[PDB]
């Protein structure tokens, strides 16, 4: 529901050429920059402070990098489809091509676990991951993710 107001078409990338996970994270800071009240450097540190604890990869080419910060007052996200898979240090050893990033304010945690939990559910389905890997438009991506 709120996933829709959090993922506009302007926050979706369909064919990003990226070589490293570090690179992927830098590009994310840029996408979520300022519209989150934070500089891309701060958005980056926030996502990496968490990735530090361990890979946010869910297994099977999917991942959900995320972070919280007192400066964020409204949840915001983005979706990335890589041209080539990226070594994500995932739980099953396979690289990732589908990345959903989420930046949340530091307040309504419980509600956030909901968004993450629901998303993971969608990603656990083979046919959903297969669609996200073939659809041509960003609108199709949104339709599937919602």
TrEMBL record:
**Residues in PTS EIIA type-2 domain copies:** 5-146
GO molecular-function term, one example from the UniProt record: protein-N(PI)-phosphohistidine-sugar phosphotransferase activity
- Known EC number(s)? 2.7.1.69
Q: What CDD domains does this protein map onto?
A: PTS_IIA_fru
Per UniProt, the keywords (alphabetical) are: Transferase
User: Which top EC class applies here?
Assistant: transferase
Q: Which InterPro entries match?
A: PTrfase/Anion_transptr, PTS_EIIA_type-2_dom, PTS_Nitro_regul, PTS_SugarTrans_NitroReg
One of the protein's GO biological processes: phosphoenolpyruvate-dependent sugar phosphotransferase system
Q: What's the domain of life for this entry?
A: Bacteria
Q: Does the keyword Transferase apply?
A: yes
Keyword Transferase recorded: yes
What is the recorded name of this protein? PTS system, nitrogen regulatory IIA protein
Can you name the source organism? Neisseria meningitidis serogroup B (strain ATCC BAA-335 / MC58)
Q: Which gene encodes it?
A: ptsN
């Amino acid at each position: 529901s709120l996933i829709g107001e959090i993922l506009p078409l302007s926050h979706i990338v369909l064919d990003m050429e990226v070589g490293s996970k570090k690179r992927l994270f830098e590009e994310a800071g840029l996408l979520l920059e300022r519209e989150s009240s934070l500089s891309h450097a701060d958005v980056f540190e926030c996502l990496f402070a968490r990735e530090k604890l361990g890979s946010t990869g869910l297994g099977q080419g999917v991942a959900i990098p995320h972070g919280r910060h007192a400066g964020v007052k409204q949840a915001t996200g983005a979706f990335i489809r890589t041209r080539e898979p990226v070594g994500f240090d995932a739980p099953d050893g396979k690289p990732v091509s589908l990345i959903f990033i989420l930046l949340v304010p530091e307040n309504a945690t419980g509600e956030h676990l909901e968004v993450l939990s629901k998303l993971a559910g969608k990603f656990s389905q083979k046919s959903i991951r297969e669609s996200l890997m073939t659809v041509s438009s960003a609108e199709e991506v949104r339709a599937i993710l919602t």
